[PDB]
Ligand binder design. Structure first.
Ligand SMILES: *Cc1c(COP(=O)(O)O)cnc(C)c1O
Ligand SMILES: *Cc1c(COP(=O)(O)O)cnc(C)c1O
Ligand SMILES: *Cc1c(COP(=O)(O)O)cnc(C)c1O
Ligand SMILES: *Cc1c(COP(=O)(O)O)cnc(C)c1O
Lengths: 391, 397, 399, 400
């Protein structure tokens, strides 16, 4: 083999896949990065050679988006991947493809609020029955499955309570029951957990959070384990017109190269911050998979690779008013906003951004979600200490 | 005392002024004449109490650049509001997802855009929604087919690719009398030639990919709503389905929309000349263009078309499918053999051999797509080069 | 006849003007068929071997880039030159000209009412290199003939001039410089190739600020040097690599998009400008109007000989009442007008050089370069001309 | 620590630590919208509200200044520890602006003889035509710089580490010498990055950066930066950048603002991988010499540990046994994940041989005078798994 070739029998290791996976220099010019195909249509050789070069119209497929999809499928370990404008678009495409009137769908009751509301308020009007259950015990999944059940939709770790779901056990249950297991691994990243290695049928990802990790783009990704699922997803994406654009795909191809080192820094910072918070006299409870008080420490040790993530949560003593004061006084470098998984550490209120339906979802009084970034951990802890001084 | 930066109080801007400036003012912070690109996911909040005080939180729900474009588009189309989407298909599917439910009936023109038709029949009907495809050239047919289950009447004019016209005013009168939502896709028309919201339509769907862009650069869609209620439901469902337009695409479209009037004027003058040339060419059987006397709906065209008759035309070659294939395989530069329309670059397509090549012949003659039908999207090149290329190609058929 | 197929031009085809603006120097992407050139937003290019170094034509984006190269071939075709080199700004292009073709002890003739950037560039920077710049009247070519020295290497003309709209006979000056064997460089930013191509008229080098009409949307900055011979082009290319002022791929993509509508943009701008100049010429508050399309124009013979299709989107006038009247007018110019510094855009722009850009310079020099006290520069856009005239009328009512 | 600041403010008197500055320096949420990232002002001109309020909002024309570029410039000035900074289309543009602003006919300028080939070519092929004398000397000894200073000397242009021999220059001693002799000190710290060495901290007057390499670190954009220690130097550079029309674009500034946030962790990973790779290469039968500041064989190890912070860098060099032919064989058989190209400092590992690619048309004596031997290989270590990089290098050396 010569320059530009991978060694025969090569299995690139993880970080190599994040830097190089599924992307090669441009054949025409040798450009080390994939050029941006900011372009609607593609000229055909003739009528008989329609699609001979692989492209026709950017709503159906785009070369930059295709390069990103190949990289994403390689990173998550699936057959194929389809990229979308947003993570909600990926979720909605899954629900549109695999649910018909009369079908049943099991969802984790602490899913992302957008997923829950899109199921509850929109798709329910098509006479699809969504049942929200506790995924912490896989036996609940096994006993709630009906003959009409098509999709089991898990999420691990959960937004924002950080509950874990045993992806391997749930997937075994679903294979025995012949139902599609879809897993939302946005909080974990493939660097900490790949549900496809654990038997899941589909992975859904909001690339907005960690794939980007720069507060730059929006994006979604559906990673399919087989060709049939992938082809159904691709067809429906073309039908619904929610494909990701070439510029976003270029941004994400760039940002994905640093996901491992970013997540390593974020999870080290998060470990230190969780320990600090767990020894703080104004903090009632701290949720982080890496500290011994984590209720699902056994599952986290079984399921998490490399790290325990940049996401944590905590409750301030005194409830809603103390939490609101603290968040109103959290100083820079923190940012009080709605995203997560970025270089910029973010602090959020889930509720104030009915308590009867929220206390059942785990978001109790004074629940604070923390997305740790890559700043100096001491500056972050200084800001947190000052903010807690106002609680 | 009107000063620099203000509009004169009682002076409504005219059309081209609206296309250049509509709904976009210089950046308050810096004075930037173009609004900056908010290539940015999230927006910092001043406090928990002052949530959304500056109007933004998350770009999937709303983005400042996208919002500027939406204000310009709503101004140009003459509606209350607008929501911009990643594609035109996204906008159409958002309409269908918002206003249809199992058991409802929806009327669509049988010569709709292929994507609209395929989206209805292969996806939404699995939700037990009945889509009936009737001929919209006679509004009394729409008046007949409306039932108590009917919720949406989906018209298109001019139609892709047959350029059939629908009388938006008469159809809107019908739907208003019958209390049913009239949605019109005027992508082929552009707001410069026809504004369905002026003609009584309740919703307009646009694929900004075509003429709003006009440069083969971006994908995009738009839903322009006549009332606050329709706009609010479209906005909510767009946030739910995550198919909003990107900020970079919105910037591109804000740039290209400024030249839509002159672009469409050049394209339509070129198209008139090309249609006349084709109509007096011996290897051409039929020519379809609203601006030549042989157009079957000349009365409606003169009634509801403004300024121009469009850059789209169509024609049939003598000898049918094989002759059309030969000709299209021999259409030289400056022409492009591809799938888009409405761009500065002139484009030749065969919907029977490219878009509906997998479709059977028996049902493609019902869409009016004869085999040998050729869709022409005229660009802004010198019309003599375009005619020379067409003549060379026709010599091969 | 022939047997060319789709994607081919007819044999020996010479595209007409507008066709060159839409398609010139750009073919679909050979790899994918993409109708537009993809953006090569990347720094370095991988080589397949030591032997095949540069075999695919690219190594490093500072030296050259595929998107920039597409734009450069298009611009060379549009201006009718051998080659083109694209730069980050128009001033970058001009500075590269001056850096390449002047040395200590050399003489260079510049039009006295040149653009302020070129004048400042020569007087405040390059003069330090013992290059002697002389600023003369270019409205009479015999002035150019009489000012040429044995040490002269460059004659830098500009037509129409920024902002006086003075013209220069590019053909006669080109004849003079050919006779005495000195390089003729011409800045035709204000004209655009759609109105005047100096290389057609015997110029050796054309300099363009693509920021203005090439862009025409107030979006990007950019410059271009178009060379009539391979030797000049190679010198410019080498120095552009040395100085690191190449245009970026994103800017090149923007300009490739915007250039496609320059003909229709300029047609609309010039029709609007003709109507606006005719309106202002009759105006109570207006002292003079300067536009090549009205009989008032002093150099109308040269304009009719030298201008193709249009007389441009630029005009200028003088408000009666001096600097205070100018200031009142500017302070009350309403939308759709904009009070700013660019020109050639779809958005109509208006400004007064004496109180904004040239406020620091002494009145004697302003009058020396023809910029009177009430001088107003007007870049006409593509808005409805009636709204523009209404705005001008109100602003003048406050004068 | 008893104050009353709230969300959006820094703590009073706060000086953030290094990584915090890389993420947040020079940048705050957008006042209009709260946008956490600076919007891209893809925009030429800026409307003025009045004749009297001209420039009251800070901007007029993007060739002179642009808000995105200014945000990046503030971040860079904070990161390098300087008064001000101006950003340019390329690094060569930054260097060219320095040479244009501070040199006149008859002036003398000392340049490190192993400077980046572009700077050397810039000096000899273009600026020397203005009767500016450029003398190229060995900067590894500050006494050489002091003895080589002439009455007409105005600029001393150091580089450390130098492209590509990785020679070091004692920035602090050279700065002391220049400050005594009242001469400008410009330092090209492109290879080092501010994360490893900040020459303004060590007394330099001007820092020149190619943001193309490590600031970007993604093979994405070109750019340059001039960081000035005083307002006077900064104003001179600003004025001349407006004259030269070589300012950075807003889009490039946005890209670089994005990528600068990960420079610390990127450089940490790159330098750890580079330490391992240099050891593995110090260790090979086909390798004659390895040059990396982090291994004991480095000739300037003492200066390296005095001057370098946190890391020893992602750049290394070595020389294969067997000269140009073995070097060519290895280069022709360097497999993925390596790339054979001309940039450096990126996430993608890059390898090249200057004597056969960029300096191939250069005389051999001229190359050996700069220390570019026949088997000389320049290695830019990325952030891939170091074992894959080592396997690729081992396969390539097997075919040498
Ligand atoms: C944010 C999020 C989503 C939605 O992705 P978007 O890009 O915002 O549409 C889905 N799932 C999870 C777990 C998320 O955190
Ligand atoms: C092309 C087209 C569409 C689809 O719009 P996209 O932007 O391609 O998704 C819808 N309607 C009509 C009339 C069209 O021509
Ligand atoms: C504006 C202008 C220039 C300078 O070009 P920039 O892109 O602004 O640097 C040069 N010449 C003329 C005639 C101009 O109008
Ligand atoms: C690459 C480089 C430069 C030139 O910077 P560009 O961005 O390529 O113009 C200058 N100095 C050093 C040390 C370099 O490595």
């Amino acid at each position: 083999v010569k320059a530009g070739d991978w060694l025969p029998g090569f299995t690139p290791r993880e970080e190599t896949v994040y830097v190089h996976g599924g992307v090669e220099p441009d054949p025409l010019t040798g450009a080390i990065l994939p050029p941006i195909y900011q372009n609607t249509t593609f000229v055909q050789e003739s009528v008989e050679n329609y699609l001979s070069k692989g492209f026709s119209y950017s709503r159906t497929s785009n070369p930059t988006v295709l390069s990103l999809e190949k990289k994403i499928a390689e990173i998550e370990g699936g057959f194929g991947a389809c990229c979308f404008a947003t993570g909600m678009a990926a979720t909605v495409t899954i629900f549109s493809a695999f649910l018909a009137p009369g079908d049943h769908c099991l969802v984790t009751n602490c899913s992302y609020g957008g997923t829950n509301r899109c199921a509850r308020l929109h798709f329910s009007k098509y006479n699809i029955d969504f049942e929200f259950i506790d995924f912490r015990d896989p036996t609940n999944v096994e006993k709630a499955i009906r003959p009409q059940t098509k999709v089991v939709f898990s999420e691990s770790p959960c937004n924002p309570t950080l509950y874990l779901a045993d992806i391997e056990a749930i997937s075994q249950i679903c294979k025995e029951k012949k139902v599609l297991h879809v897993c939302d691994s946005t909080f974990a990243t493939p660097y900490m957990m790949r549900p496809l290695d654990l038997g899941a049928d589909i992975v859904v990802q909001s690339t907005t959070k960690y794939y980007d990790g720069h507060n730059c783009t929006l994006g979604g990704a559906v990673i399919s384990s087989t060709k049939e699922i992938h082809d159904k997803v691709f067809f429906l994406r073309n039908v619904m017109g929610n494909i990701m654009s070439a510029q976003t795909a270029f941004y994400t191809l760039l940002t994905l190269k640093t996901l491992p080192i970013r997540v390593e820094k974020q999870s080290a910072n998060a470990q230190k911050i969780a320990e600090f918070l767990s020894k703080h006299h104004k903090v009632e409870h701290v949720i982080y998979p890496g500290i011994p008080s984590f209720p699902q420490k056994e599952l986290a040790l079984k399921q998490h690779k490399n790290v325990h993530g940049g996401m944590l949560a905590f409750e301030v003593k005194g409830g809603t008013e103390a939490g609101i004061r603290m968040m109103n006084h959290v100083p820079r470098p923190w940012s009080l906003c709605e995203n997560l998984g970025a270089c910029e550490s973010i602090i959020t209120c889930p509720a104030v951004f009915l308590r009867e339906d929220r206390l059942k979802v785990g978001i109790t009084d004074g629940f604070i979600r923390v997305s740790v970034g890559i700043e100096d951990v001491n500056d972050l802890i200084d800001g947190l200490d000052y903010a807690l001084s106002k609680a």
